Amino acid sequence: SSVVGLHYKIGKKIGEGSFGVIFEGTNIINGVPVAIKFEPRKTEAPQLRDEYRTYKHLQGCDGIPNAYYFGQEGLHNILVIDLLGPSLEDLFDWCGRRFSVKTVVQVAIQMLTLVEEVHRHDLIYRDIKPDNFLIGRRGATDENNVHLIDFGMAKQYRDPRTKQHIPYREKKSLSGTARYMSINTHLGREQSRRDDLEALGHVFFYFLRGQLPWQGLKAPTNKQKYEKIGDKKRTTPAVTLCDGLPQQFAEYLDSVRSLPFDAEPPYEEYRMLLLSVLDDLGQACDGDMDWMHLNGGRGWDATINKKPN
Ligand SMILES: Cc1ccc(-c2n[nH]cc2-c2ccnc3ccccc23)nc1
Ligand SMILES: [Cl-]
Numbered sequence: 001s002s003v004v005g006l007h008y009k010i011g012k013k014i015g016e017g018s019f020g021v022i023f024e025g026t027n028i029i030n031g032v033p034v035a036i037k038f039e040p041r042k043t044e045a046p047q048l049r050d051e052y053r054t055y056k057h058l059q060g061c062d063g064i065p066n067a068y069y070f071g072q073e074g075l076h077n078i079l080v081i082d083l084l085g086p087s088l089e090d091l092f093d094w095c096g097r098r099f100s101v102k103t104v105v106q107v108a109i110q111m112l113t114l115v116e117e118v119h120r121h122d123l124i125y126r127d128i129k130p131d132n133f134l135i136g137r138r139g140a141t142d143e144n145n146v147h148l149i150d151f152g153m154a155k156q157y158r159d160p161r162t163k164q165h166i167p168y169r170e171k172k173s174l175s176g177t178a179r180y181m182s183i184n185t186h187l188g189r190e191q192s193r194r195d196d197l198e199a200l201g202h203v204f205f206y207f208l209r210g211q212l213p214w215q216g217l218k219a220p221t222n223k224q225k226y227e228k229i230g231d232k233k234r235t236t237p238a239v240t241l242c243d244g245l246p247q248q249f250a251e252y253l254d255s256v257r258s259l260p261f262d263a264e265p266p267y268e269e270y271r272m273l274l275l276s277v278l279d280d281l282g283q284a285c286d287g288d289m290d291w292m293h294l295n296g297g298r299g300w301d302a303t304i305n306k307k308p309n
Contacts, residue, residue, distance in 0.1 A: 186230030
């Protein structure tokens with residue numbers, strides 16, 4: 001049958017890189033579009049169910065899609081959430097692999113708020129990358145707001161009742177994305193709130209510069225390449241990353257790298273710090289984003305942009 005979870009008609013495939021295939025779909029009661037993820041039920045790393053629980057735990061958070069359904073059908077488990085738009089990596093690419101200072105500040109404070117809400121719900125994200133932050137759909141009220149998906153790497157960092165932080169430990173696996181992950185992650189250290197925010201700082205410099213200086217490194221093995229990347233991170237001062245850029249971005253990176261393991265980050269201080277960039281430059285925080293000017297003011301286009309995607 002073409003309909004799963006009673007109410008969701010399967011449409012075209014829209015990717016498969018995480019655990020399972022992802023499809024578009026439509027709610028056959030109201031026509032609202034959805035994203036549908038399939039996980040093979042006979043898998044040794046069951047993950048979809050825990051992701052449904054994470055979405056349900058974050059229900060009501062701005063920028064976190066609703067999960068409408070989870071169930072088993074045939075040989076698959078199925079999860080259904082809101083359908084969103086292109087990722088920030090997509091939009092970055094279509095804007096020529098550089099975002100303006102204003103667009104970086106504006107997405108940064110939204111990304112800080114998203115990660116803050118994750119943290120307030122006792123979770124760390126552990127897979128920060130521009131590919132997992134998505135905008136909305138064309139014409140929607142949240143068309144150009146930033147959203148966060150893919151919680152397969154998320155983990156509880158504190159007991160929900162007592163707020164007791166997990167213990168520090170080392171010899172952790174190097175799971176994550178080497179371009180953005182924190183220095184602590186390279187060193188096999190248990191991640192905490194500070195590591196999500198340091199990865200954000202790397203993403204901010206990536207958007208501003210167009211590249212990070214630890215891209216393009218060579219080594220015979222993935223393990224040795226990750227190590228060289230971590231080495232480069234440890235030997236590149238934030239003011240060097242920030243050459244010719246507003247120094248608030250260096251101050252942010254140094255700050256979150258200095259956070260104690262169990263410390264609560266001052267999220268609003270960080271947001272005010274980056275907002276002061278716009279004051280310095282005489283700009284307004286008015287929601288105008290680089291990608292809104294693509295294609296003559298029309299916005300991103302499926303055959304000009306998303307087809308090279
Ligand atoms: C159940 C479920 C469905 C999808 C996803 C997902 N994973 N990565 C990106 C998306 C994703 C989410 C929402 N709208 C999209 C639109 C286009 C491309 C990807 C997405 N996760 C869980
Ligand atoms: Cl090796």
